[PDB]
Structures are given as structure tokens and as C-alpha cells.
Design a protein around this ligand. Structure first.
Ligand SMILES: CON(C)Cc1ccc(O)c2c1C[C@H]1C[C@H]3[C@H](N(C)C)C(O)=C(C(N)=O)C(=O)[C@@]3(O)C(O)=C1C2=O
Ligand SMILES: [Mg+2]
Ligand SMILES: [Mg+2]
Ligand SMILES: [Mg+2]
Ligand SMILES: [Mg+2]
Ligand SMILES: [Mg+2]
Ligand SMILES: [Mg+2]
Ligand SMILES: [Mg+2]
Ligand SMILES: [Mg+2]
Ligand SMILES: [Mg+2]
Ligand SMILES: [Mg+2]
Ligand SMILES: [Zn+2]
Lengths: 98, 206, 84, 155, 60, 86
RNA sequence: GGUUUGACAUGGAUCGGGAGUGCUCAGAGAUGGGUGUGCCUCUUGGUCGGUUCACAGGUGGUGCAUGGCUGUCGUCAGCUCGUGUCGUGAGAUGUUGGGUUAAGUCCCGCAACGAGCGCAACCCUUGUUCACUGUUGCCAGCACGUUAUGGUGGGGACUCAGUGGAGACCGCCGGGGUCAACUCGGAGGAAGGUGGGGAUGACGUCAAGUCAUCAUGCCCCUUAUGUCCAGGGCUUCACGCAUGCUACAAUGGCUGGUACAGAGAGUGGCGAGCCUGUGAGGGUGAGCGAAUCUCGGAAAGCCGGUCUCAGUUCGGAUUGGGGUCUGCAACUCGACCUCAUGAAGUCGGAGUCGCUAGUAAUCGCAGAUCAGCAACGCUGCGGUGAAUACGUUCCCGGGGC
């Protein structure tokens, strides 16, 4: 019941946000499933290092998306208001499935 | 010619990204507006001296941290210049901009402002050796553990290009735990432009 | 080749010019840059100046042309041979 | 290499016949990285061997290998303005390797249709004392004897 | 790139198939990534400077 | 043989059942993983009478040999494009 | 073929109210002509118009005017400084010597004593293990499920996912090593002497590459070297070189059946299922913004049948016919399907290239760009999986004295 999907690029801020969510809902009772980590999206970009005629030397980059999942077993409309009104860091987004 | 950018090398390890937002269907357009914001701010606020522009987004609302040595230019008189630059920012982007301007505690220790000053002196036609020595001495008076400055180009208005450099202390570029601040600027002279690069070893971090 | 269910592609101004020529007498050279178009029976017996990049080379369309494009009859490159 | 003798990977034994020789034979056939194909070939050849003679196929393979094993072989030497063919004694591992390589190559060169019993025919001929492998062993020994005068250049 | 080419690419094409990408910072028409616009060089330099969130060097 | 031989080198023999759930890899890799699993099971069942021989046979060890990654400018992990001077 | 403050910027004036567009006409189109629709404040703005005025524009020149970025010697083991000292001086010493190391890595001695950039380590990934969490993942014990599918309640065991820890340090034992660094052997251990791989490229060299990614000094163009458009070209072909792919077959071809992956991508997208077609495909069309749904089939391999050494049931070039799809449009110049055609090629001259282990060899898979695709390229991913290294004499590159 009540899904919370957290996505960001830094696992430190992911973990901090998940801890804040779970400690908030708990402060409002509502027992909630622990933050379960989904597989991290791993996009890879290869780029010719030089601006011209040098293809054998290249640079690789990744955009790792870290995802965590929270279940709010207890309905608790007070926790509903809390989870819609609290503030989260800009780097992480929130997805609430009612 | 073959050296990596220190900031990119230490990105994620010790230093952090200048932009903090998440978006997976608009990523390109947010990148474009960020580029527009940064170009506009750099082109219209040279006088203040920009260490960094840090961009955050929550929901169609953008937040700009402007790390400047002298925010007097940015704030103008009683925030008039701050209001006008914010208004130009809404005009440029179309979103709600919350702009805040922060000091740099040690401008003589921040590499980007050091490159700013060295390039300004070179443009004002100060002897490059004297400028580099002054910047180096000021950095070590502040208390940096290592300075390295390199000016490349038609130094002194000459014809051939040189790559004159100064350094003392320790600047371990190869060490990832080493906190190395990197700055770069271009002195626009009557003879092309001079590239000034500055590495400053702040210390060691975990 | 073009899908059958989409029909032949005639560039929709070549068609109107050849139809006007049919209505007012099949005697004129129709200048066009539409190498892109499909030869059709309705233009049989006409002469069409197909652009080849620098000049409108004339082709007299006969019965057997129909299954071909206008640009097939207006070569764009000149070779003549290596050396001489 | 300059640093020193690189370590050798241990040789495993064949599960069926329980001899490292057959494993070395399959690893020498072992074209294209197809271990299963190579040892299907090898097992078929050994079974054909035990079909045509009652004796054990591993024993007949061993006898063929001893009949193809070279004792000494000549190598090029850059002494002076002309090249020499210095005869050098061959260690047991090197000579087993040479015997296996020659067996496999001449089996591949045989005229019969299929590789499995091309190799089977070559093995039987070598064990008897005939074939291209034994001929090459004799020729190399003959040329070593011809150039035997340079046994004092060994280092 | 040329300014006329940049504005022509920006404007809606006559036929849908005639559109192309262009580096949104740079104008470069080759090697433009759909994920974040930009181009080869623009991606490399901006990722090094740290304006692209989530993008870091990969050394797996 | 590679999966049966843990029993052969242990005191127990083919009078001792086993159930295996196998995932990933190819046939030979799965064989090696199953062999190591049986060796570890025999280990943690009898770590005194089967441990010495079982470890000496090099079987309570997982070989880290894994496919090396491809590298830029090279056709494969180490294969290089054909060098052509002039 | 059009255009000239210009395709696009910024600023002053000046006449303004529409700009901007829908439908039509002419045109290859650019563009031009119709027709419909026609600012929000306010008495003085947003927006556009011309006329100008400033000005823009240039992938035009110079990479030997430059910045930036990159190759390269070269992952090579080095390159220097402060002070002292020696010498008239350039300069030397340190940094030589002995030992060792992958390493200017350390050790010993030493007119040197120190330090810095490089080496190493810190980072990522892989190999072992623990704690925490348990869905979209997993199913050992428990209860049903349409027969059936962890489908179900449920479970923290196993696997895995991903956060935080542990673990390797010549740390222990023995020998060698004047000792000392190191070195050899052994135990423990998933792993032992740097465990494997990546990121990381010192001072500098080559006036090395890039004025065409960007930026820029100077010079040059300004009813044209700007700029718009249609068509053409970048795809030419007596030839030469280079990098690849498919081959020349039987360790193979064809055919039926049947196993085992990893890493990735997806809403103008990935598309299942069903129907239709020989097929490419078409028609319907769920599901999935995705550990859920889809791409999906892995191929090599194994097993059965068949071909029987044939320029072939090898090879699949070329050429003729009939098509599909994308696209405004496949003539020049797309991929694909199908029918037919069936070229050279019998293992390649002198010469030359890659590779020391999960490597070479081969086997398939995925992604970037991308409507489509000439991709056999590139960057990754796993499957199968070798042979050999006596050695430094010789060839090439480099290091200390
Ligand atoms: C010609 O003008 N005068 C006489 C001198 C000159 C003047 C200005 C330049 O800007 C260059 C040159 C010489 C060329 C020579 C070039 C050549 N290369 C094109 C094959 C070459 O042989 C090498 C090389 N193998 O190393 C180079 O150095 C090179 O590339 C180079 O840098 C050059 C320049 O650009
Ligand atoms: Mg396109
Ligand atoms: Mg080359
Ligand atoms: Mg140059
Ligand atoms: Mg050049
Ligand atoms: Mg290093
Ligand atoms: Mg040059
Ligand atoms: Mg220019
Ligand atoms: Mg071309
Ligand atoms: Mg996605
Ligand atoms: Mg090696
Ligand atoms: Zn760009």
C-alpha cells in the first residue's frame, strides 16, 4: 500500500532522503516496509577525446540513476499530508503512487 | 596537452556537481537553459568576478547560487541590480528564479578568482612574471599548501607563443584525495588572448 | 522501389503540365527539375527537359519509358574515359 | 621473456582414458576453440584404433608418440657472416610437444575424407613405424646428424 | 557553426524528415546526443566542469 | 567429471544425493560453479576429514578468471588492430 | 533561380496597429498575389513594420600570431629545485657507487642535507565474506492454486539487487640476504607477494593536429567570399595503397529437435498475442516510462537425418523478374524480402601483423548516432576456449652508468 519511488544520482542523498521519509512516517505511526534498493540505471557515453582526427583515445562517462522503494503499509491520512508537504533535496525526486 | 581537468578527475570522488536536479524527459532542455543562464551571467557579470554558478531545480522553479568575490556589483544599490538580473533571468528562461549571491572567504585562495585577477592584469598590460609572482605570494600568505600558475600565449605582446609557469609548495595532481581547486581564464589583449591556468592545493580531504 | 499501395509518384506539377499539354495539344517541351517523378502513360509521346544538375536535357518519352523515373534518362556525371 | 621462465599450466587428464596424453592431443587438435568437437574427433580416432587392433588405444597412441619423438633438432645460429644449424638435444616435454604437433599436422594433411580417422590412420601408421610424421622425425634426425659438427656451440 | 545554419535548424522544417539536431550549445551538427543535446566536445568539457548532473567519468 | 570428482576426492562416493539450482553462464562455467558449490558443501559439512584433501586438490577456491573487458582502440580485450607502417 | 540592415542579433530614432497565420493562386522552390482572422495596457507599454542609422554575416585566409582540446615519445622511470659544497666559468654534487625493485621502489655507503613533480597509494570494477533491507527480485519450511505460472498468503534461509563494513599487510613460519631493503619456500586463506582490469600520462619533445566544435590577433568579402531555394555533387573509375568482412569447404554445408548467457534500450518508443502473406511485411493490438512489459531468438554446442571431396548441396559476387518498408521523394544514391542467375576463390609472391590466459581463436548479443540505412565500422557484453615462452645471441623501441 502507498508506493514511494525515490530516484537520484547520488546514493548518499538517496539514502538520506529515504531515512527522512521512513522516520517521518514512523513519527506519524504508520509502520512502513524498509527502503529496498532497485537496480541502478547505468548509461554509458563514449566520446572522442580530441576535437579532431584522434579516434583511438576516448573518454567514457556514466549517468548512474539510483532508485529506492518505500511501502507505506499504514494508510494514515496524517502521514499522507506529511509526505505531500515535506521538503526534499533538489537532486532527488519523489513519486507517490496512492 | 595531455593533462586531465582536475575537477572532472575528482568529480564524484571529492568534489561535487555544480547542478543538482533530476529530470528524464526535459533533461536536454534543462541543460540548454542552464547553459543560457551560465553564459548570460558570465557575459554580464565579469566585473563582480564569478567563482561558480550553482543551479538547483525543484519543480519549474530554478535556484541560482552565485559565488562572487565582490557581490557589490551584483547587488547594486539596495538590491536594484539583483532585482534587474533576476528579472532578466525570468525573461531568459520563463521560470521562477530564486537568486542568492554568496561570498568567497578567501578570494586569494580560490583558483578561479586568481585566474580572473591574473588575466585582468595581463589585459591591463602588467608584466606577467610580476603578476604571477604576486598571485603566488598572496596565495601562500593566505595559506594554500601549493600554488601553480601557467600563462600561455603571446606573453608580452611577442610573436612566438610561450608557456611561462610558476609553482612552489606541493600540487599532487595525481592524488584523488588531494583537494585541488582549478581555475582558468583568458586575458583578452590587443594580441589575441592569453590562457591562464591556476591549480591550488587547498589540502587533503577524505 | 516505391510501395504499390502508395501508387506511382508524379510530382503533381509535372502531372498538371502534361495534362494541360494534352488538353491544348501534345506539342511542346516541358522543362522540369523533377528527376523525382515517375513516367506515366498519360505523358507518352511528350518531350520533357529533365534537369541533370546543370542543364535541362530533353527526353522524348516513348511507350517503354513508363516503368522508369524521369531522372534515369538524364545522366548527371560525365566521364568520357580516363586519359584520352 | 627477460624476467624468467613463465609458469606452466598443469595438464589435466582425460576423464575417459585417464591419461594426460589424450588431453594434450585434444588440446592440440582444438581448432577454433571447440573442445567438444576436438575430443569427439579424438575419441572417434581412438575407438577406431581399438577396433582395428585389439591393443589399448592409449597404448597405441603412446607407441606412436615414442616413434615420432625427436631426440635432437637443429636451430639457426648467427655466428659470423653465415648462418649455422646447431644441433640441440630436446627435453622430454619439448619432444612430446613436437611429436603431438607433427602427428596433428600430418593427420590434417592426410588424403582421407574425415579428420577423425585421418588421425586414426596416422596414429596407427606411426605406431607401426610408417607415415609422414615418422618420416619427418627421421629427416630432422638425419639433418641433425649431418650438422653434428657444431655440437660444441651449445650454451 | 554558421549562424544562418543554426537558425535554419532551429526553425520548423518544410518536411518532417528534413529536421536535424545541432549542438544546442555549440551548433555542431555531428555527434549530438539525444539524451542531453550538446555534442562530443560540449559533453566532454561540460561533464568535466560538472554542470551535467549524474555524469561522471567511467572506469569500470 | 569436473562436478562428480569432489565426491571422488572426498571420502563419500556416489551414494549421497545432491540437488542443484544453476543460473547464468555457459555449460562449462555452470559445471565449475556446481563443482565449487559441492566442494564447499562437503567442506562445511565435514571441515576436518574432507577439508585437507578437498583444499589440497585446489577445489575450495574460486578462480576469479573472468572475461576481460574490451578497450578503446583495440579489437578485443587485448587484440590490436593490424599495425601498418607506411 | 532569388535576395540586400540582409537568414539571425543589439540599440536609437520615425510611421503605425496588428504581428503572426488559416484557405486559394502563380512558381522547381525560394518567393510573390489573393482571401479569412485580426494586439494587451492605455493616452503613454508589449509587438511588428518599413525608411534609414548604427550594424550584422563569413565552415573566407593564416594551427608558423594564438587560447582551448588532443596525439606522440611513454606507463617510459624520469625531470628538477632550495641550501650547502667544488670549480674563474659554463657547470657539478645531491641524482655517482653496492644491493634490490614493476618503479629515482627501497636499502647500504656517500659533500651532501632536503624538498617537488612523476612511481606507489587514495578512486572505479572484478574475486571471498558479514550486517541491513525484501519489490518489480528470490522460494528452503507452511497453506492453495483450473492441470498449469512464487500465481497465491507468507518467508530472511539460499540467489540477487545496493548501501555500509571486514579481508592481504611479506602480516605469520623457515632459509637466503654482513645485516638491510629485498628474495625463496610453507601455512592459513576466496585471493600471496602489485591478485586481474580501468581511470590517472612527470619536465618536455615533434613551429605534431585542429582558425572546420568553440574562442580569437591581423588580413580579406560586403547587390557578395552574406543569405534563401530547387536540382546536382560529396557515391565518378584505365588504376595504387590501407583497414575490414565473406570465403575457398567435411573440425564442413543443409535440415529437424533440443540446452546454457551477460550487458544494455524503450512513450512519434519497445510491442507481445491472434489473424493474413512463401517471406520482408500488413491488419488489429494488450502490456510497459519499465528488476514488473517488450526488444527475446542467444549463436557456437549437443542429438537425429542427409550431402560424400565434386569448383560441389563449397562460395554468394554479379545480373534479370516480382515485391515490402521508411520518407514530400529511394533515377543518380537506401535497407530488406522473394524467384532465378551462380562469378573469382583449391589457402594466397617478396614482405608483413596481433596476442603470454579466461589472452589468442572463434560464437552470438546490445548500445550510440539514427525516419530509414549502405554498420562488415565503433564502443561494450557474455558463450566456448587454446598452444607456447629453453632463453637474450640477433631485429625494433627504450632505461642507468
Ligand atoms: C611548408 O611551409 N614551410 C616550408 C614550413 C612550414 C611553415 C608553416 C607551417 O605551418 C608548416 C610548415 C612545414 C610543414 C611540414 C609538414 C609535413 N607534413 C604535412 C607531412 C611534415 O613532413 C611534418 C612531419 N612529418 O612532422 C611536419 O612537421 C608538417 O606537418 C608541418 O608541421 C608543417 C607546417 O604546418
Ligand atoms: Mg536526418
Ligand atoms: Mg595509423
Ligand atoms: Mg602546432
Ligand atoms: Mg594542416
Ligand atoms: Mg598512479
Ligand atoms: Mg604544421
Ligand atoms: Mg574565421
Ligand atoms: Mg566520401
Ligand atoms: Mg528509461
Ligand atoms: Mg604482456
Ligand atoms: Zn558543441
Amino acid at each position: 500500500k502507498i508506493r514511494i519511488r525515490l530516484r537520484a544520482y547520488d546514493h548518499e542523498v538517496i539514502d538520506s532522503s529515504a531515512r527522512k521519509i521512513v522516520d517521518t512516517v514512523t513519527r506519524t505511526g504508520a509502520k512502513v516496509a524498509g527502503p529496498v534498493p532497485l537496480p541502478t540505471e547505468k548509461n554509458v557515453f563514449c566520446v572522442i577525446r580530441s576535437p579532431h582526427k584522434y579516434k583511438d583515445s576516448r573518454e567514457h562517462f556514466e549517468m548512474r540513476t539510483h532508485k529506492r522503494l518505500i511501502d507505506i503499509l499504514e494508510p494514515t491520512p496524517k502521514t499522507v499530508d506529511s509526505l505531500m508537504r515535506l521538503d526534499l533535496p533538489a537532486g532527488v525526486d519523489i513519486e507517490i503512487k496512492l | 596537452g595531455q593533462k586531465i581537468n582536475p575537477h572532472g578527475f575528482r568529480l564524484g570522488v571529492t568534489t561535487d556537481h555544480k547542478t543538482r536536479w533530476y529530470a528524464e524527459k526535459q533533461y536536454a532542455e534543462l541543460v540548454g537553459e542552464d547553459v543560457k543562464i551560465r553564459e548570460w551571467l558570465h557575459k554580464n557579470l565579469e566585473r563582480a568576478g564569478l567563482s561558480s554558478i550553482e543551479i538547483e531545480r525543484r519543480s519549474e522553479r530554478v535556484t541560482i547560487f552565485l559565488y562572487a568575490a565582490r557581490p557589490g556589483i551584483v547587488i547594486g544599490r539596495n538590491g536594484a541590480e539583483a532585482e534587474r538580473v533576476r528579472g532578466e533571468l525570468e525573461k531568459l528562461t520563463g521560470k521562477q528564479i530564486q537568486l542568492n549571491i554568496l561570498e568567497v572567504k578567501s578570494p586569494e585562495t580560490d583558483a578561479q578568482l586568481v585566474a580572473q585577477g591574473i588575466a585582468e592584469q595581463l589585459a591591463a598590460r602588467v608584466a606577467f612574471r610580476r603578476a604571477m609572482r604576486k598571485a603566488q605570494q598572496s596565495a601562500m600568505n593566505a595559506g594554500a599548501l601549493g600554488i601553480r600558475i601557467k600563462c600561455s600565449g603571446r606573453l608580452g605582446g611577442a610573436e612566438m607563443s610561450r608557456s611561462e609557469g610558476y609553482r612552489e609548495g606541493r600540487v599532487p595532481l595525481h592524488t584523488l584525495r588531494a583537494d585541488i581547486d582549478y581555475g582558468f581564464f583568458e586575458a583578452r589583449t590587443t594580441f589575441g588572448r592569453i590562457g591562464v591556468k591556476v591549480w591550488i592545493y587547498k589540502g587533503d580531504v577524505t | 522501389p516505391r510501395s504499390l499501395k502508395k501508387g506511382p509518384f508524379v510530382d503533381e506539377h509535372l502531372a498538371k503540365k502534361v495534362t494541360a499539354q494534352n488538353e491544348a495539344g501534345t506539342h511542346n517541351v516541358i522543362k522540369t527539375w523533377s528527376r523525382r517523378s515517375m513516367v506515366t502513360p498519360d505523358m507518352i509521346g511528350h518531350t520533357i527537359g529533365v534537369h541533370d544538375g546543370r542543364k535541362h536535357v530533353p527526353v522524348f518519352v516513348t511507350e517503354s519509358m513508363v516503368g522508369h523515373k524521369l531522372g534515369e534518362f538524364a545522366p548527371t556525371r560525365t566521364f568520357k574515359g580516363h586519359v584520352k | 621473456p627477460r624476467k624468467g621462465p613463465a609458469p606452466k599450466r598443469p595438464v589435466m587428464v582425460d576423464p575417459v582414458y585417464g591419461s594426460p596424453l589424450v588431453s594434450q592431443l585434444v588440446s592440440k587438435i582444438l581448432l577454433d576453440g571447440k573442445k567438444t568437437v576436438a575430443q569427439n574427433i579424438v575419441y572417434t580416432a581412438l575407438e577406431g584404433c581399438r577396433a582395428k587392433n585389439n591393443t589399448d588405444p592409449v597404448q597405441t597412441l603412446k607407441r606412436a608418440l615414442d616413434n615420432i619423438k625427436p631426440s635432437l633438432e637443429v636451430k639457426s645460429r648467427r655466428v659470423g657472416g653465415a648462418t649455422y644449424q646447431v644441433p640441440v638435444e630436446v627435453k622430454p616435454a619439448r619432444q612430446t610437444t613436437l611429436a603431438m604437433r607433427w602427428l596433428v599436422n600430418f593427420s590434417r594433411e592426410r588424403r582421407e575424407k574425415t579428420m577423425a580417422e585421418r588421425l586414426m590412420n596416422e596414429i596407427l601408421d606411426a605406431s607401426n613405424g610408417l607415415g609422414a610424421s615418422v618420416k619427418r622425425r627421421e629427416d630432422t634426425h638425419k639433418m641433425a646428424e649431418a650438422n653434428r659438427a657444431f655440437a660444441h656451440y651449445r650454451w | 557553426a554558421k549562424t544562418a545554419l543554426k537558425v535554419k535548424a532551429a526553425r520548423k522544417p518544410k518536411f518532417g524528415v528534413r529536421a536535424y539536431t545541432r549542438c544546442q550549445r555549440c551548433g555542431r551538427p555531428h555527434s549530438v546526443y539525444r539524451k542531453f543535446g550538446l555534442c562530443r566536445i560540449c559533453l566532454r568539457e561540460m561533464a568535466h566542469a560538472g554542470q551535467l548532473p549524474g555524469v561522471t567519468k567511467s572506469s569500470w | 567429471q569436473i562436478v562428480t570428482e569432489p565426491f571422488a576426492t572426498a571420502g563419500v562416493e556416489g551414494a549421497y544425493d545432491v540437488i542443484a539450482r544453476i543460473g547464468g553462464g555457459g555449460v562449462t562455467g555452470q559445471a565449475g560453479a556446481l563443482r565449487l558449490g559441492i566442494a564447499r558443501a562437503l567442506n562445511n559439512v565435514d571441515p576436518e576429514a574432507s577439508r585437507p584433501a578437498l583444499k589440497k586438490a585446489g577445489m575450495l577456491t574460486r578462480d576469479a578468471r573472468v572475461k576481460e573487458r574490451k578497450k578503446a582502440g583495440l579489437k578485443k580485450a587485448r587484440k590490436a588492430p593490424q599495425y601498418s607502417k607506411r
